[PDB]
Amino acid sequence: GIKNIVYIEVNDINPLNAGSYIMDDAPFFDYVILFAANIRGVGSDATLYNNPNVQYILDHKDTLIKPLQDKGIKVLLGLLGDHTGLGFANMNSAQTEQFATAVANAVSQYGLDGVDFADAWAEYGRNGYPSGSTGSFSNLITALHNKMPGKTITVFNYGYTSELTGVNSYIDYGIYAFFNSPSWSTGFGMPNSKFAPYTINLNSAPSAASAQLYSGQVASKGYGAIGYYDLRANNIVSVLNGVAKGAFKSTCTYDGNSYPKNY
């Protein structure tokens, strides 16, 4: 049961567009990631910051999130560094529990299905924060798991993720971080059934022939997911139908609904 996991840049793209692709009377995509809320060091606090676009979607969850979940799509909050020098991987123990508390609170408050960690753009070490890893990234996954054990946690395989092997039982999926070409390996010791070794950039899209070939390999090699980054509001069905044929022996169709970002 390969899962299709798509990241949506909510600064540009209305997440409802993920619901416009259909394969076998179900949404093509199984997980939608609202990319992204940020971790921000503010003095000695580790903070969760939702920019106006993220916060608008969360404030309008009944119209911008719930319709996806009503279709059976799991909707996750993306988490990304934001240039303050503090990131997932250089926190002390107090900051780790602060950030875990903030994230779990966001998931419960907005009725989300989980979170995705993308350890990018933290600019580790700026503003007096540690320049290297403190080992906090593994403790953060454990803290968050303990606060919300039935919710999904995915990890984009970028940054300090190599440290996560000891905690990987708490991680549902890992996603390969480079686009349009598979790497037949996994990060942080994940089994193949919990990894996407192939991640399609839906903005700078590959050919449908490359998507069908590589997705068929994802399936025949027993991997459990395929990643998709930057679904836009155009009709990208030729690529997704390539995957449907390759990985799912099926087809994917587009319903024509291009949802605007008018907020």
Author numbering: 44 to 79, 80A, 81 to 201, 202A, 203 to 225, 226A, 227 to 306
What does the paper say about this structure?
The genomes of Bacteroidales contain genes encoding glycan-degrading apparatuses that typically co-localize in discrete clusters known as polysaccharide utilization loci (PULs). B. thetaiotaomicron contains almost 300 different GHs belonging to 60 different GH families, and secretes at least six mannosyl-glycoprotein endo-β-N-acetylglucosaminidases (ENGases, endoglycosidase hereafter) that hydrolyze the chitobiose core of asparagine-linked, or N-linked, glycans (EC 3.2.1.96). Altogether, our data suggest that human gut microbes employ evolutionary strategies to express distinct ENGases in order to optimally metabolize the same N-glycan substrate in the gastroinstestinal tract.
To better understand the molecular mechanism by which BT1285 specifically hydrolyzes N-glycans, we solved the crystal structure of a catalytically inactive variant of BT1285 (BT1285D161A-E163A; hereafter BT1285i) in complex with the Man9GlcNAc2 substrate at 1.9 Å resolution. We observed no substantial conformational changes in the protein backbone for the unliganded and glycan-bound forms of BT1285 (r.m.s.d. of 0.4 Å for 271 residues). While both BT1285i and BT3987i inactive ENGases bind to the Man5 oligomannose on RNAseB, BT1285i exhibited a 1000-fold higher binding affinity than BT3987i (KDs of 3.5 nM versus 4.3 μM). By using size exclusion chromatography (SEC) we determined that BT1285i forms a stable complex with either Fc-IgG1-HM and IgG1-HM, but not with IgG-CT as expected. SDS-PAGE analysis of the SEC fractions indicated the formation of a 2:1 BT1285i:Fc-HM highly stable complex.
